[PDB]
């Protein structure tokens, strides 16, 4: 039942600031130290910072000292990373992770991460279009359908189906970089062709960097 | 900073066979308290990363017993006794004896399975997108193996070049297949100048290339 959820990732200009959060549930948050770890292009995984259970000690990797500050609010079950003086090297997925009772053993549970993109480019939310099931997307009693998510920046977009109740047979593809510098992706799912008239399929698109949420009902073609 | 060198970097494995991932540290990881602070982590598609092993050989809650760790000093091994489809992902060692803690580069495990031909589907542009001035045509190759596939676009039998982009998934954790999308993007005016839109797929599991197509309108 331990769950960690990071938020706050998005685009930030070099030299400016960004605060990340991590919401904890399913354990006694004040009993645990907490870490931040990041995964940057070409660097792999890098440990960033730790805070004690009670906030009484804090440590940092050398390259973020004087720039990042770790803090926590135990009453709100939340961990924070205040990132100032951002550098191009800081573009990465940032994870929070629950501390082990010896520092050298690291951390056991992690969140899914939040992506920080250091860039001078503007945020842009996506356009969402249906990929309708038709005679051209069916075989052997199965039908494929999807949503096309076009022209957003920075990454990422996440896609769920039917508010997360539809997971079997879903594929959400890695985003592709267009020559415009904007991203696009698609998400598809395979379902029974027999019940296209009775089941409702909605793709739920979230571009957290722009606070853009779109729910698109995908109607069959006939 | 201590350097952690993993090998191999890619590890293809047949289902049910063992797998070994090796890690060497640039300094001994034995600490003055008697403990060796060497950990293993797993990243899986769709899941948060998690620790598997700490203190060389101790296993975390929720980690199946087919995972074990061994080694000493500078040399360590993560062993999977019988690889399952759900073990695809990337595995990392991490040392915590020296400041700062450091990670290895990761080993990607993938499953070698039988050939599976793609199921091929095509989607014309939506009317909503067309009203905005662009036409994206999507070709979907679903649930195939191996990952190598060739997609070609033909518009009124003219081979296209320069106006499509492809993306492939990570290997699936249940059936060990890949899926791929190829998107052809045209202006609305160009889209309306032609009739037949086709994608042709070549793959080891197909005896000859398969074409999926539609007529605009």
């Amino acid at each position: 039942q331990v769950q960690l959820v990071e938020s706050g990732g998005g685009v930030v200009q070099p030299g400016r600031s960004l605060r990340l959060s991590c919401a904890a549930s399913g354990f006694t948050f004040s009993d645990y130290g907490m870490h931040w770890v990041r995964q940057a292009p070409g660097k792999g995984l890098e440990w960033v910072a730790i805070i004690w259970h009670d906030g009484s000690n804090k440590y940092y990797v050398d390259s973020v000292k004087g720039r990042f500050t770790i803090s926590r609010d135990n009453s709100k079950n939340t961990l924070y990373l205040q990132m100032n003086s951002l550098r191009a090297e800081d573009t990465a997925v940032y994870y929070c992770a629950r501390a082990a009772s010896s520092f050298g053993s690291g951390f056991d549970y992690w969140g899914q991460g939040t992506l920080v993109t250091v860039s001078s480019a503007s945020t842009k939310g996506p356009s969402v279009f249906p990929l309708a099931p038709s005679s051209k997307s069916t075989s052997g009693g199965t039908a494929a359908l999807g949503c096309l998510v076009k022209d957003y920046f920075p990454e990422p977009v996440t896609v769920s189906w039917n508010s997360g109740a539809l997971t079997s047979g879903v594929h959400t593809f890695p985003a592709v970089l267009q020559s415009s510098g904007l991203y696009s992706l698609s998400s598809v799912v395979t379902v029974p062709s027999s019940s296209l008239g009775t089941q409702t399929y909605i793709c739920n698109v979230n571009h957290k960097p722009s606070n853009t949420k779109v729910d698109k009902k995908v109607e069959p073609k006939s | 900073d201590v350097v952690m060198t993993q090998s191999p970097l890619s590890l293809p494995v047949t289902l049910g066979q063992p797998a070994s991932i090796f890690c060497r540290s640039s300094q001994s990881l034995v600490y003055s308290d008697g403990n060796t602070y060497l950990n293993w982590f797993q990243r899986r598609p769709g899941q948060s990363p998690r620790r598997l092993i700490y203190k060389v050989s101790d296993r975390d809650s929720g980690v199946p017993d087919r995972f074990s760790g061994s080694g000493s000093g500078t040399d360590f091994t993560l062993q999977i006794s019988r690889v399952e489809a759900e073990d695809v992902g990337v595995y990392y060692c991490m040392q915590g004896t020296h400041w700062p803690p450091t990670f290895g580069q990761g080993t990607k495990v993938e499953i070698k399975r039988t050939v599976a031909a793609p199921s091929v589907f095509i989607f014309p542009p939506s009317d909503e997108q067309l009203k905005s001035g662009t036409a994206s045509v999507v070709c979907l190759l679903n649930n195939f193996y191996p990952r190598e596939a060739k997609v070609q676009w033909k518009v009124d039998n003219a081979l296209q070049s320069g106006n499509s982009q492809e993306s492939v998934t990570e290997q699936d954790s249940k059936d060990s297949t890949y899926s791929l999308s190829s998107t052809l993007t045209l202006s609305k005016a160009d889209y309306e100048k032609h009739k037949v839109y086709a994608c042709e797929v070549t793959h080891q599991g197909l005896s000859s290339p398969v074409t999926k197509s539609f007529n605009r309108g």
Binding site: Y32, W52, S102, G104 | N35, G96
Partner: peptide, 11 residues
């Protein structure tokens, strides 16, 4: 200035 490997950050 660093945390030792046997430091305990937990309650």
């Amino acid at each position: 200035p660093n945390a030792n490997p046997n430091a305990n950050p937990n309650a």
